């Protein structure tokens, strides 16, 4: 069983064999930590780089998680043993490692904690798990109650396996004074720089218990012995025997020994993380370590997730989407902008459309966001591949390699902003560049910006590719420094079109006509060389040739120039029905739209390294939700209205039982994407790659607040104009804007020709609430034919 | 139970858990296996770079092996799991997964092979791996025998797991024409050189069988279920399911059902490996997949290790050593000479190292490692950090961090090549240097390589240390370009005290005059600032402080400056009884000698790396066997016999059954460690590191041809020296020397006063066999007071 509890506070999986790979998530604002529902969990720290206390049994590459994440049995993960005494029998909370028999099993998603209720052997488990604001622990609650008749003796073991943590140094032993167990490493380099980099590294890891315990151990071997995970030597015994890691791989084990009375229940606290030394694991320990410590940080937690709920609660008659929009949406999208994805360069990108999401949130972030991306912008115009957040940092992994789209996004996003705030004073607020002297207004640096793109522009005046767009790894297209992208240039004739009308806005007269005309000029260049007769062409390679059109047996039609061709005004009214039905006999999917089709089987090395990956993961065909937003938003943009519903719908899995169980997926977040290659490989089509990292979440939002829902903002004011689909008779939401909020009713009537509003019972002309104050609450029925 | 058999060809072991960790090695031209006596198996192969074809379920770092490998129960490894059809019992060989009760466990360590003998529920299973010379390929032959009266139903599967190959792509499928299973993926990247790079990648892995199986499963997840590795759903079904791997972990499971009567015995072959293709994969088919394939590749195989059997076979009264010196020692000398331990860029210390063992193996092969080296040399003088075996190749790792000793080597190990082959014609061969267009003799590179040694000394006339020395992880002594090393000019001193002496007999005299003037300029120098009155120190670093001395409580004393000193003259008759006893009283234990003593437990950072390992491991107070030999070579070149003779044997673990359990080793190889820290740490003192990649071996072999049983080179002819223990009434050797044979019998007589050497039976004055002739046979009698 799956379902929502808690009045919308948990999700709660029943099964813990149904959907193996299901997971939830939780952040804060140094770390984060994806949990399966089986006990697996992946946990990354920043300090300020990422960093791991819980490490894999081998000498592991430095990553987060990989996209469809295998787990295995000895893979880190978050565990509780419990023996009756009086028999040897043995299971494991949450479910590994010993996978027994349970009588039941409950795993519950939270807004701001993760947990499990599970029995087996008449004796019921709860485990809970939260962090804390601002600090790197994770908070662990167990309790254990006898649910029979009759006294019971059990053991209870909580199982926190450490890992190898180093080659070069690694130990492990309890430790009295700080009440638990410490396990120490020394991170292995080579180079003496990375002595002075690595000296304030969290080298220690703790499990601090605030019970003291009938004994420990520290040794994993000694843990197992021959009977395993599934049977640990240690648990057969009346006694863990205490053993310490001396260069050996080291564990956290304890062993608690209680009789407890019909219907008694005991509660046992336990904090988990990393450690720079023992006196921080006690600051961490004095200051968490307790009921109140626990209460504090969880009522802090709330407060903070509850700051974030942004703008928009809805009723309609999906009670799926109500469920995912009110109570998942909001917390998804304001993890990517309140902490960048943990990443001290944020892929620009990624850091323009995260902190876009924050627009509907907290727009102050937001703000700020472009003042600091902004402030590291090019002399030339041009945009960094990354922003970096903390001095001293660099770019890392993909910013290394040059892409070319980045400037793209500054009036795409920006113009979020404008619109839901009214801040064009932000355009005013004066900036350095990245080197030299010039400071200069938002605006100018954007205008430069603007400037940069058109000037990054071939002959024949399309948009240079050089080794990436915003596909990542399509890197073999330009990289001889000739190639152009066909979605680089649709989608710089929108920005410019955006800006234009920034410009005209603030009676920068001059630069709305010289951008205008680079837009029109991008757009006669995109007809004349990318549009291949039923949708528009990729890009052209470096020796001429153009790709994603009908000659090429894969990658036949990528979605992202059709959706920015409309966007942009490349796509005609002739053109757009060539795009939307291409895109329906090619792309769609019960999942959702494919970004691109049938997908890649074999490297081609005039596109490059997109096409090497899996056919149906990531950038490969996958149903990329990120790329399927921007169609979404596009279709939108022209009132497609029921496509637009249909496909924004399908991101969200469920109720249908077979959609549920082949996604595999919790329907708690929005996953990078769902398995694509639908037609090559239809068993695995749909599924999750479990990835909540995305920037699909704030265009998916966006698209719901501003379009579906239509209460989108303009400089006079709230902007009524929905997109609902037809099906529904009725719906209302609630909309806070500019420090008010709207309770909308939305209703069809036979008796009206065209749409009718009324506020607060009497009838508007135009579509526009002009009258707002902040604090107040205003009635707005919204009666559609 | 543990001993040789099969009149030395093999080693046994007969318990699965006692020695848990124990293991032995393959190797073949490019590639190398480690075999765990449990099942888990470690492979690395070469094209032209390291690259595996079995990997671990994560995404794991770029690594061989660590020392004290941990293995987990998802560990690559080699396995074959059994099923009754009549009873659902199973149970796998070697012993994991499954861990079943056993009635009888064989694991046959081979010079040529490795190989077990299990047996369960009355089936008994024979195992057995080898490798061809010259192409990457694991031969893998299993034999199945009904040991009872009655017909018996069984289900027999191979389980090669393929592990997670790549976040990329990764796949696997089954392939009638290859005739078994292809597992494939891209080796993942970023950057588009890289592309270009990695084209010949065999990025798939292949798993194919002689005979056609009922059923086959591909996908991991599948092939576990529930039941785990330890009951795999997919073995208690009645046929595999067939599936394959798209985008998940892949694996190599095949399914043979047969009915065997009683005492038949069946026999299945397969091979397992990299491939770039299919097509490669079936030629590796055809040529080995056969009964005559793998007969062929045996022979070719045992001709290869007797090829390089070496030159000493000896008849001691201590039959353990006996063994290893005939048995083992050779072939693993042999290892690291003609493979160089399979880097494109082997550390100069070990390329000259290794190579210097290979002169009592195949000369010619040493002869080419100097020329290789020499024409590497810089114009300075100065010797790289690495040698290149490759064009295009690159120095890695530790390789490019400076370290300053490269050239002691040089005359170090090359006394040993003209000892024993009296080819100083090699001394006029003409090489060229690493870069500019001067073509000089080996020995002009050979004076400049001394004179560099001379010139890289501070004002004290001490050697600067840089980043490192011999230690390699010593790196905070002098990186601030002042610190000096106490090893490295008492070694200088050694190594230009040879070479003056090489000069003198190539009437080179002014060279001999400069160098020996050389060696007494440095020794002076570290006895008015090195010798800390019993011992000599480390090092003096970039401040001015003098460490490995009394006032340290930490690194108090270290080795390898005492050997040192004793080679090379600055230890004088009055210095060295102190070394002596400070070696005896703060370094010696039961596994050998330590290479420094108290173990480092925190940082010194003006000594630096070395002193973050864990206590006892590696450099860092181990009983670093490749410093205990040098100890050992020192003991013999002042006549310490039974101090040498002591410190040698101790090396080699067992009889003694504690010892053979606390190191944890099968006696066929020298590991590169003994854990160490014996009084900081005893438990875990003499744990084997279980790498036989060690220098330690080519030292060993020459102190055993050489010194113990002293049968060493000159230029007259062969000197006859033994230093052998006073236990020993009798022994016999046989040398291969210079093309001939010497049957070499020693006796202890009281009717003596000096030792008498016999010749065919007539007794010949001095102590030089002069009078050699290639393919004689000569005999030998060394009567000794
Ligand atoms: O780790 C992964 O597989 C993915 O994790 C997160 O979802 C990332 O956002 C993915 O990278 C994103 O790829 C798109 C398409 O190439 C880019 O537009 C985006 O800036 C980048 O974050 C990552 O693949
Ligand atoms: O991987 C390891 O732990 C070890 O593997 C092999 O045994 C190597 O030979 C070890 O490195 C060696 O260290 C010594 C002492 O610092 C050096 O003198 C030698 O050149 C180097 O190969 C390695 O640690
Ligand atoms: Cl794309
Ligand atoms: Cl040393």
Redesign the pocket.
């Known amino acids: 069983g799956l379902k929502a509890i808690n009045n919308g506070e948990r999700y709660q999986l029943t099964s813990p064999t149904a959907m193996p790979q299901s997971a939830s998530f939780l952040w804060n604002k140094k770390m984060m930590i994806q949990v399966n529902c089986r006990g697996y969990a992946v946990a990354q720290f920043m300090q300020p780089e990422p960093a791991k206390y819980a490490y894999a049994p081998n000498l592991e590459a430095k990553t987060?998680?990989?996209?469809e994440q295998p787990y295995y049995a000895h893979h880190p993960g978050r565990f509780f043993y419990i023996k009756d005494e009086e028999t040897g029998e043995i299971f494991s909370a949450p479910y590994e490692p010993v996978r027994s028999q349970l009588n039941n099993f409950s795993f519950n998603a939270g807004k701001s904690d993760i947990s499990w209720h599970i029995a087996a052997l008449g004796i019921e488990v709860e485990l809970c798990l939260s962090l804390p604001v601002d600090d790197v622990v994770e908070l662990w609650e167990l309790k254990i109650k006898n649910g029979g008749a009759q006294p019971r003796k059990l053991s209870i073991y909580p199982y926190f396996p450490v890992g190898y943590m180093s080659w070069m140094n690694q130990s492990g032993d309890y430790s009295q004074t700080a009440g638990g167990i410490i396990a120490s490493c020394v991170t292995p380099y080579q180079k003496v720089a990375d002595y002075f980099k690595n000296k304030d590294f969290k080298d220690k890891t703790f499990f601090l218990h605030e019970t003291a315990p009938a004994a420990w151990e520290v040794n994993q071997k000694n843990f197992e012995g021959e009977g395993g995970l599934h049977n640990p030597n240690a648990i057969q015994q009346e006694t863990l025997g205490c053993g310490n890691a001396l260069y050996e791989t080291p564990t956290a084990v304890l062993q608690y020994r209680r009789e407890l009375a019909a219907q008694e229940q005991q509660t046992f606290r336990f904090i988990f993380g990393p450690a720079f030394d023992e006196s921080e694991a006690i600051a961490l320990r004095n200051k968490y370590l307790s009921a109140e410590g626990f209460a504090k940080a969880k009522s802090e937690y709330q407060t903070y997730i509850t700051s974030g709920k942004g703008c928009l609660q809805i009723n309609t008659p999906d009670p799926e989407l109500n469920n995912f929009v009110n109570h998942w949406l909001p917390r998804q999208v304001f993890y990517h902008g309140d902490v960048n994805?943990l990443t001290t360069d944020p892929?620009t990108?990624?850091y323009i459309?995260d902190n876009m999401g924050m627009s509907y949130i907290k727009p102050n972030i937001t703000r700020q966001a472009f003042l600091h991306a902004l402030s590291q912008q090019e002399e030339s115009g041009a945009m960094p591949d990354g922003i970096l957040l903390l001095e001293g940092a660099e770019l890392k992994y993909?910013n290394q390699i040059p892409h070319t789209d980045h400037c793209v996004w500054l009036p795409v996003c920006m113009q979020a902003y404008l619109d839901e705030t009214n801040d064009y004073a932000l355009l005013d607020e004066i900036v350095p560049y990245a080197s030299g002297e010039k400071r200069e207004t938002v605006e100018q640096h954007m205008h430069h910006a603007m400037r940069w793109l058109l000037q990054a522009r071939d002959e024949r005046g399309l948009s240079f590719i050089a080794q990436?767009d915003?596909?990542?790894?399509?890197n073999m297209v330009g990289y001889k420094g000739k190639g152009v992208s066909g979605w680089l240039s649709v989608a710089t004739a929108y920005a410019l079109n955006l800006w234009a009308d920034v410009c005209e806005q603030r009676q920068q007269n001059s630069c709305a006509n010289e951008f205008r005309q680079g837009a029109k000029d991008i757009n006669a260049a995109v007809n004349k060389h990318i549009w291949d007769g039923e949708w528009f062409g990729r890009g052209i390679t470096d020796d001429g040739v153009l790709f994603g059109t009908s000659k090429d047996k894969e990658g036949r039609i990528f979605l992202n120039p059709q959706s920015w061709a409309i966007l942009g005004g490349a796509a005609d009214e002739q053109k757009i029905p060539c795009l939307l039905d291409a895109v329906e006999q090619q792309l769609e999917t019960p999942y959702g739209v494919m970004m691109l089709a049938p997908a890649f089987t074999a490297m081609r090395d005039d596109v490059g390294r997109?096409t090497q990956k899996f056919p149906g993961s990531?950038?490969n065909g996958s149903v990329?939700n990120?790329?399927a937003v921007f169609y979404i938003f596009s279709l939108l943009s022209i009132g497609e209205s029921e496509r637009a519903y249909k496909l924004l719908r399908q991101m969200l899995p469920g109720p249908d039982e077979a959609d549920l169980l082949q996604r595999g997926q919790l329907p708690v977040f929005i996953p990078?994407?769902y398995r694509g290659a639908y037609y090559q490989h239809p068993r695995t089509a749909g599924r999750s790659?479990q990835?909540f990292?995305?920037?699909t979440v704030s265009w998916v939002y966006r698209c719901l607040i501003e379009g579906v829902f239509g209460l989108k903002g303009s400089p006079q004011g709230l902007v009524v104009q929905p997109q609902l689909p037809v099906a529904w008779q009725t719906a209302e939401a609630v909309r806070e804007f500019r420090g008010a909020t709207f309770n909308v009713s939305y209703r069809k009537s036979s008796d009206i020709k065209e749409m009718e509003i009324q506020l607060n019972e009497s009838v508007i002309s135009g579509n526009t609430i002009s009258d707002i104050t902040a604090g107040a609450t205003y009635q707005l029925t919204v009666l559609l034919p």
Chains 1, 2 share one sequence.
């Open positions: 987060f998680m990989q996209p994805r892929q990108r990624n459309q993909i990436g915003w596909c990542d790894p399509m997109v990531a950038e990329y990120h790329a990078n994407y790659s990835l990292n995305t920037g």
